[PDB]
Structures are given as C-alpha cells and as structure tokens.
Amino acid sequence: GGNSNLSTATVSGASYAWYSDSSLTSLVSTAQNPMIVNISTDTTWYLVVTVNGCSSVAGSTTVIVHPTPVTPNVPANFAVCEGDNITLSTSTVASSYNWSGPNGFTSNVQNPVVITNATTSNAGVYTLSIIDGNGCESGDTAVTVTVDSI
Amino acid sequence: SSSTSCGQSQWIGPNGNSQSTLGTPGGSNVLWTIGSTTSIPMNNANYLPGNWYMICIDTVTGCRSESNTINVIINANPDTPAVFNDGPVCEGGNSNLSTATVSGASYAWYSDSSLTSLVSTAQNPMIVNISTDTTWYLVVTVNGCSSVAGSTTVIVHPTPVTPNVPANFAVCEGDNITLSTSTVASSYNWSGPNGFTSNVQNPVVITNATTSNAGVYTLSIIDGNGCESGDTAVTVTVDSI
Incomplete structure (x- = not known):
C-alpha cells in the first residue's frame, strides 16, 4: 500500500516515457x-x-513489496x-504495538497497563496489531474478555 | 507567388531542375504552372521547406529569367500531449x-470539449x-501551431x-451510557452533549448519567482512503430516579 520513487x-535533449507493461502498450508517466x-x-x-526522434x-525496474x-x-x-x-500482554516483538478496546482502552506497549477493579464496562474485545522493524503493519488479532458479576 | 507577369512559371524546389520532376506544364502540376501563382497541398511530394526559386518562361520567345530565393519554413504541429493527475481525490478535494x-510552448487548459472556455495557462x-x-x-x-x-480525468473517490x-x-x-460502533474506520469522530467527544470505535463510558448527558450523539467515519462518511446519530434519554 505504500509508494515508491x-x-x-x-x-x-531526451524525453522520457514510462510504461506500465511489456510491449510498451500503456503509458503511465513522462518524468525523469x-x-x-x-x-x-x-x-x-x-x-x-x-x-x-530515436528511441532506446x-x-x-522492479519494486519489491516487503512481506506482510x-x-x-x-x-x-x-x-x-x-x-x-484484566491483564493484557503479547508474546511477540515489535517496533511498536497498537492495542485498543472497551472504555477507550489503548496502549502502545508489549505489556499494557493493567485494568484494575474490572467492571462489566471493560468487557468486550481487545484488539492488537504490530508494527515490525521495517515499518509494516501486521493483521489484527483479538482476545475476548468477559467480566463475571459478583 | 509573384507580382511579375510571366507566361509560364517553373518552380524549383528541393526536388527541382530535372525532367522527372518538372513535368508537362499546366494541369495538376504544382511545379510548372501557366502563371505566377502555385499552390502546394500537404499531400504533395513537393510540400517541402527550404530554398525555392522560380524561372519565368516567355512563351513567345523562349527566354528565361530567374527569381530571387526564398526560404520556406514549414512548422511542425506538436504531438498530442499526455496529461496526468494525482489519482482519486475525495469529494471536495483538490488535485494537480x-x-x-x-x-517554446505556451499551454492552455480548457474546461470542456470543443475548447470553448479557458481555465488556466500553466504547465x-x-x-x-x-x-x-x-x-x-x-x-x-x-x-503559433497548436496541438x-x-x-485527463480526475476520479472522485466514492463517498x-x-x-x-x-x-x-x-x-x-x-x-x-455506553456508545459504540460496529464499523471499521481509520478514525472515528463522535460528538455530543456535555462536550462529549471521542476518536475511537468504543468511546469512554459516561458513568453516573444525569439528564445533562441526554441528547443526540453523532458519529462520522474517516475511511482508509481519507474520505469522510455522512453523519448518523443515536438519541439518548435519561430517566429521572
């Protein structure tokens, strides 16, 4: 999803023409x-x-997309x-972590601040995605947390 | 052409001065006319730039007199230009x-077919x-020659x-009072009574609800391409105890 030059x-004295495919059938840009x-x-x-008037x-060139x-x-x-x-954690290593959930819960670390005195308003789905060392974001995973009334 | 009155006029272009070019005078023969003016169409072998001259032929005596020399310039029409843009843009946005x-070119951008209305002059x-x-x-x-x-078409991203x-x-x-949305967004924009605001899918719960929190809670979404969706809202009432 990123861009590259x-x-x-x-x-x-040259003009430049960049084409999208083999056989040069479709022009995409004219720029150095x-x-x-x-x-x-x-x-x-x-x-x-x-x-x-003479064409080369x-x-x-190939732009490689980094593996997700x-x-x-x-x-x-x-x-x-x-x-x-309610204690949340992840076992993986990331450049950064992005947690989100009920009650506006959010965290940017491997071991988020513990939610104390859990009430049913903290029940719900806690979602995590990871930014790797090359800057790419991983897909979401999540844990469902329920709270049992006393 | 020339103002000098000549019986016949033999034109010498880059291909001239030989019997294979200067064929029989009159008729559809642009290089050997029966008067001083000649017209050369674009679909003609002799439609060439360069140094031209004319020989005046006296049809009574056979005498010949040569003209002055002119440099004919034929300019090229520039190629149909390519036009590119910034890709899909959200409704109301701008694009280059x-x-x-x-x-040596001047540029003219027109708003419509048939080029009736000019909008800008810029590269x-x-x-x-x-x-x-x-x-x-x-x-x-x-x-002076126009292409x-x-x-190009700028696509507006679907709302x-x-x-x-x-x-x-x-x-x-x-x-x-618990608010939430079921959709996925780049960001969320919630607003409501008592200055309530939130930027997430599951906003902070409003505890100890009082009637000052009653009212209309409105939500709009920013999608993955940066465009904002239309508003929807939930009315929340508070029942006094």
Missing part, C-alpha cells in the same frame, strides 16, 4: 523521476528514452471476576 | 494536473473543489458508507 539518468502510488505487489515499470530499448508481518500472539479468551484485574 | 515540458495547474469525475483538455502551442487537445450506530436508547439516571 523511480529514478533514472539525466540525458540531455516518477512515483508509483499504492503498490500492492511486486511491480515493474519500463522506461524508454527518446532523443532527436526499454529499461526496467505475522499476526501478533495474544492470549485466549479469558474471564475475570468483577473487581479483579 | 501535469504535463510534459515542451520548449501543472490545480483543479480546486472537485465534486465529481471531471476532465480538463490541454492544448500546447509552439511557434490536438489531450486530456464511504454511513456508520452503524445503535438505536435510540434510554438509560436510568445514575446508570451508564
């Missing part, structure tokens, strides 16, 4: 250094440089007695 | 257009406040779907 050599926007998979652009053989990181390791559904604590 | 740099103009899919046309003019209008919010509820005075 392409770049090439400056050729005096165009950007590819919203890349979902490994993709290639082809480049033709034309000087004084298309050059090319693995879904976080989060505990199984648990239950807490009303008045007791 | 861009084209190739053509040395990379912006379209402001786009409500629907829209197109601009581009004409590039060099040395065929190129064009996201109205948020899913609970039905009107009632809370007993002293009890809790």
Whole structure:
C-alpha cells in the first residue's frame, strides 16, 4: 500500500516515457523521476528514452513489496471476576504495538497497563496489531474478555 | 507567388531542375504552372521547406529569367500531449494536473470539449473543489501551431458508507451510557452533549448519567482512503430516579 520513487539518468535533449507493461502498450508517466502510488505487489515499470526522434530499448525496474508481518500472539479468551484485574500482554516483538478496546482502552506497549477493579464496562474485545522493524503493519488479532458479576 | 507577369512559371524546389520532376506544364502540376501563382497541398511530394526559386518562361520567345530565393519554413504541429493527475481525490478535494515540458510552448487548459472556455495557462495547474469525475483538455502551442487537445480525468473517490450506530436508547439516571460502533474506520469522530467527544470505535463510558448527558450523539467515519462518511446519530434519554 505504500509508494515508491523511480529514478533514472539525466540525458540531455531526451524525453522520457514510462510504461506500465511489456510491449510498451500503456503509458503511465513522462518524468525523469516518477512515483508509483499504492503498490500492492511486486511491480515493474519500463522506461524508454527518446532523443532527436530515436528511441532506446526499454529499461526496467522492479519494486519489491516487503512481506506482510505475522499476526501478533495474544492470549485466549479469558474471564475475570468483577473487581479483579484484566491483564493484557503479547508474546511477540515489535517496533511498536497498537492495542485498543472497551472504555477507550489503548496502549502502545508489549505489556499494557493493567485494568484494575474490572467492571462489566471493560468487557468486550481487545484488539492488537504490530508494527515490525521495517515499518509494516501486521493483521489484527483479538482476545475476548468477559467480566463475571459478583 | 509573384507580382511579375510571366507566361509560364517553373518552380524549383528541393526536388527541382530535372525532367522527372518538372513535368508537362499546366494541369495538376504544382511545379510548372501557366502563371505566377502555385499552390502546394500537404499531400504533395513537393510540400517541402527550404530554398525555392522560380524561372519565368516567355512563351513567345523562349527566354528565361530567374527569381530571387526564398526560404520556406514549414512548422511542425506538436504531438498530442499526455496529461496526468494525482489519482482519486475525495469529494471536495483538490488535485494537480501535469504535463510534459515542451520548449517554446505556451499551454492552455480548457474546461470542456470543443475548447470553448479557458481555465488556466500553466504547465501543472490545480483543479480546486472537485465534486465529481471531471476532465480538463490541454492544448500546447509552439511557434503559433497548436496541438490536438489531450486530456485527463480526475476520479472522485466514492463517498464511504454511513456508520452503524445503535438505536435510540434510554438509560436510568445514575446508570451508564455506553456508545459504540460496529464499523471499521481509520478514525472515528463522535460528538455530543456535555462536550462529549471521542476518536475511537468504543468511546469512554459516561458513568453516573444525569439528564445533562441526554441528547443526540453523532458519529462520522474517516475511511482508509481519507474520505469522510455522512453523519448518523443515536438519541439518548435519561430517566429521572
């Protein structure tokens, strides 16, 4: 889903044409250094440089899409007695963590602040996603937490 | 052409001065006419730039007299320009257009087909406040010769779907007001009575509800492409104890 720049050599007197595919059937941009926007998979652009009416053989480059990181390791559904604590944690390592849940609960760490004196307003689904070392976000996982009235 | 009265006029272009070019005078023969003016169509082998001259032929005596020399210049019409834009834009947003740099060119961007209304003269103009899919046309003019209008379409991203919010509820005075939405958003924007506000799917619960928290709680959603959905709302009443 990210963007990346392409770049090439400056050729005096040249016009540049970037094509989306083999056989140069569809033009995408005319720039020395165009950007590819919203890349979902490994993709290639082809480049033709034309000087004084003579066109070069298309050059090319591949932008690699970084592999999506693995879904976080989060505990199984648990239950807490009303008045007791809700403890959340994850077993994986991240650049950052993004937790969210009931009552506006949020946290950016591996071991979020414990919710004390749990009441039924803290029951619900606690969701976690992870940002890896290369900056990519993993898919969501979640734990359902119930609170048993006393 | 020439003002000098000549019986026949033999034109010498880049292909001239030989019997295979200067064929029999008169008729459809642009290089050997029966008067001083000649017209060369674009679909003609002799429609060429360069140094031209004329030989006046006296049809009574056979005498010949040569002319002065002119440099005929035929200018090229620039290529249909390519036009690119910033991609899908949310309703009401702005987007840039861009084209190739053509040395010596002036640029004219038109709002519609047939080029009847001019909107901007720039290499990379912006379209402001786009409500629907829209197109601009581009004409590039060099040395007085205009290109065929190129064009591009800016797509307006489809407005996201109205948020899913609970039905009107009632809370007993002293009890809790819980708000939530069932949809997924980049961000949420909740607002309501007593300055209530929240940016999440599950806002902080309003405890010890009093009648000052009664009223209309409104929600809008920002989607993954940055566009805002329309409002929906839940009316919350508080029953005095």
